[PDB]
Amino acid sequence: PNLVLFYVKNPAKSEEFYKNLLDTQPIESSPTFAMFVMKTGLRLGLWAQEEIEPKAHGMELSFQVNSNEMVDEIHRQWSDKEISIIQPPTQMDFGYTFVGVDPDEHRLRIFCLK
Numbered sequence: 001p002n003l004v005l006f007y008v009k010n011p012a013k014s015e016e017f018y019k020n021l022l023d024t025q026p027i028e029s030s031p032t033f034a035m036f037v038m039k040t041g042l043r044l045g046l047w048a049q050e051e052i053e054p055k056a057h058g059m060e061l062s063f064q065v066n067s068n069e070m071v072d073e074i075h076r077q078w079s080d081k082e083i084s085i086i087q088p089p090t091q092m093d094f095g096y097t098f099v100g101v102d103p104d105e106h107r108l109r110i111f112c113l114k
Contacts, residue, residue: 003043014046049064062109068096
């Protein structure tokens, strides 16, 4: 479920960098997003900076969950825990999502894919 998200200026060029670095093909690529999955299991996404909401000022630690209801449930838990939230549950083009931040402004995203 875990996914490291890097904001990138150009997903096409970033994807080539990582394909070369990792000597691995991305499992998915597009003009706006590419995803690499490590044999070890770590998942790395490269996401066009211009596509990010909330607007990007350079990465996120993200958690993929099973349904929109699970997204809402975690949102409730995080509110109860007093975790700063910078984007409430929202229908984006790729699915349903919200984002919090830690005490050092690292973004933490929960999402369920369409």
